[PDB]
């Protein structure tokens, strides 16, 4: 279920205590707060305090991100807004200074390594002619499409006493005019009339000889990566010197802005400060303790809440019992129910682990899964976060206890189905005659020989479809019920209409996959399709005429407990049997190779397949059941208690 909620709302005859009320009302956290009538309380001095605290918050998480950190909570910073700003300001200034250095080292290196190739090309195209006392050199870049325009411009402007050396490279030409010292101005005018100019080398290096300029780009491009390594080391050291201070200071600032933002949601007047908020009924004892100290001024009571009106407004939080709580991980990310709708969480522990056991159905695989449960239990026991950066996976040790609880339910059903099928690494105990059947009888009779397809397929196909019938009909019964619980007849008719149509479709199929009879099937079929055509004309939901084929396919969709189980079973068997080929053909080396090759192939196909075996069970809940009672049709308001960011440590 979702937890039952009620409205709290303290009032009184004096204004000034309301900040002390908010303080105790965040030390115990139980209340989600709306605006009590509308938001109309603030002061310009309270705005100035809120600006300074939200500046400390933003400046702390900004400088944490410059340091490459994340804004997790810590022990709160001990005292004073003035000390908060005086602690933050020198740290933020150092972090921004090291990032400003890093950005300019990046920009210098980037520009140097671009110009370095054409400068080396032109410095190799030259022979030290730049350093000549008697003549002069003009560097530029061009393309072979237009080099004749430059030769013509020089021919017209100067009396063929120039030179023009060149070399091609990817996408262009390195070009080098040479002239007598008087004529460089004429060469610059000639190039300008060809749409060309001297190549401006990036820095003040434009004043240096070309062969003297190229050396500086080369040494700076070689040296700057070492200076990047130095500023990265200094910025990492600054993080070690200041992370714990920033973490504490960001934690403080979060709580201060939470109180000062929440202060706007009070109603206000001639005496009162009236607050409002939804509270869980199991949480009331803490609200009582938070307000009992303030009975010198407050008056309060808890009002019952209507499920009909405000249903989009009341918050939703879940309250399952301890055997069902871990299975919230499989459902709470999909949607948040509306208040007074159904919570499907307790249906997850009863069907998901049972279908996983039916699919896998191997005692040898169940023991490999049990050894993963023992491994995860070590992180819970030591209180270590699991980290696997390949997946960006981090699990806090409290979440690993949720996974281990679910995995123990999956192991249990996999061993009991593994004795029903007589399966332990496929065929291994059945080669040994520990498990057997009348073809080669053994110590333990196999209850359902899963791979004896001509004997067992009809049993396992009907048994798979029977779960499909049961949950599809239960989800449609929930839709009819939740329609009546709100007098919403458009949901009632859709629920009972699809139910009657599915009874009609099944009674038709049963009467054709066999023999017809009057009383048990041919009557009930016409009642089924009669209730369907009625519910369409009553509701005027014309999407029922298309979607009845969708609903009938969701029953047949459950034959994936047999199909993926039997695909897993035969493949595991033949890998074992390939082991016994090596063991029977050869001597003691064959018993070693047979064990080794079978083990390597089993581990590989247990890696490739198992996430598929976990996924096929859960999605039968997620679409073939949850879409029946309308789980996705509306979103409830998430429960968001007024709390400290410190998470109660």
């Amino acid at each position: 279920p979702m937890e039952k909620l009620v409205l709290a709302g303290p009032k009184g005859r004096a204004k000034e205590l309301l900040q002390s009320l908010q303080q105790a009302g965040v030390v115990h956290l139980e209340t989600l707060r709306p605006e009590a009538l509308s938001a109309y309380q603030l002061s310009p001095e309270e705005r100035a305090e809120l600006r300074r605290w939200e500046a400390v918050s933003a400046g702390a998480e900004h400088t944490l991100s410059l340091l490459g950190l994340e804004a997790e909570p810590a022990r709160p910073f001990p005292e004073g807004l003035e000390a908060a700003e005086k602690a933050l300001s020198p740290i933020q200034a150092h972090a921004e200074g090291l990032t400003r250095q890093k950005q300019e080292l990046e920009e210098e290196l980037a520009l140097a390594q671009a110009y370095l190739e054409p400068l080396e090309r032109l410095a190799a195209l030259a022979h030290g002619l730049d350093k000549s006392p008697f003549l002069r050199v003009i560097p530029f870049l061009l393309t072979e499409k237009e080099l004749p325009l430059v030769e013509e411009a020089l021919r017209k402007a100067l009396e063929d006493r120039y030179l023009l050396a060149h070399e091609a490279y990817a996408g262009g030409v390195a070009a080098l005019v040479v002239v007598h010292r008087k004529e460089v101005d004429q060469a610059k005018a000639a190039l300008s009339r060809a749409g060309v100019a001297e190549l401006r080398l990036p820095g003040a290096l434009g004043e240096l000889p070309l062969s003297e300029a190229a050396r500086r780009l080369k040494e700076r491009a070689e040296a700057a990566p070492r200076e990047l390594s130095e500023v990265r080391q200094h910025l990492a050291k600054l993080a070690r010197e200041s992370a714990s201070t920033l973490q504490s200071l960001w934690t403080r600032a979060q709580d201060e802005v939470a109180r000062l933002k929440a202060l706007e949601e009070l109603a206000s007047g001639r005496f009162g400060f009236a607050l409002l908020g939804y509270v869980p009924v199991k949480a009331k004892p803490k609200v009582e303790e938070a307000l009992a100290r303030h009975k010198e001024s407050v008056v309060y009571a808890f009002e019952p809440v209507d499920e009909h009106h405000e249903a989009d407004r009341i918050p939703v939080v879940l309250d399952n019992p301890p055997w069902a709580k871990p299975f919230e991980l499989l459902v709470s990310f999909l949607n948040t129910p509306k208040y007074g709708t159904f919570d499907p969480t307790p249906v997850v522990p009863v069907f998901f682990p049972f279908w996983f056991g039916m699919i896998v159905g191997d005692i040898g695989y169940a023991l490999l899964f049990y050894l993963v449960g023992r491994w995860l239990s070590g992180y819970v026991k030591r209180n270590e976060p699991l980290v696997i950066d390949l997946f960006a996976l981090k699990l806090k040790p409290q979440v690993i206890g949720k996974l281990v609880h679910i995995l123990n339910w999956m192991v249990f059903w996999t061993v009991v189905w593994g004795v029903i099928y007589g399966e332990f690494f496929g065929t291994f105990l059945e080669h040994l005659g520990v498990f057997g059947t009348p073809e080669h009888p053994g110590l333990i009779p196999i209850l359902i020989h899963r791979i004896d397809t001509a004997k067992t397929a009809n049993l396992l196909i009907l048994l798979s479809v029977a779960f499909g019938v049961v949950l599809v009909f239960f989800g449609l019964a929930l839709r009819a019920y939740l329609g009546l619980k709100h007098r919403h007849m458009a949901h009632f008719w859709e629920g009972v209409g699809y139910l009657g149509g599915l009874v009609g479709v099944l009674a038709l199929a049963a009467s054709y996959l066999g023999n017809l009879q009057a009383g048990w099937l041919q009557g009930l079929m016409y009642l089924g399709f009669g209730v369907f055509l009625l519910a369409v004309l009553m509701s005027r939901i014309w999407l029922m005429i298309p979607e009845i084929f969708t609903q009938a396919g969701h029953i047949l969709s459950h034959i994936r407990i047999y199909a993926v189980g039997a695909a897993g079973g035969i493949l595991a068997g033949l890998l074992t049997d390939v082991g016994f080929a090596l063991a029977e053909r050869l001597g003691l080396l064959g018993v070693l190779l047979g064990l080794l090759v079978a083990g390597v192939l089993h581990l590989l196909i247990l890696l490739l397949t198992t996430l598929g075996h976990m996924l096929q069970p859960i999605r039968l809940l997620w679409v073939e059941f949850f879409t029946k009672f309308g789980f996705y049709e509306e979103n409830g308001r998430p429960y968001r208690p007024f709390k400290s960011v410190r998470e109660a440590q």
Binding site: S132, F134, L135, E159, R161, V179, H180, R181, E183
Partner: peptide, 20 residues
């Protein structure tokens, strides 16, 4: 070629400095 023909122009402007 033109790499020798510049020796009577810009080449001669450098070679003429030895008599100054």
């Amino acid at each position: 070629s033109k790499l020798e023909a510049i020796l009577s122009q810009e080449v001669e402007a450098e070679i003429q400095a030895l008599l100054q």
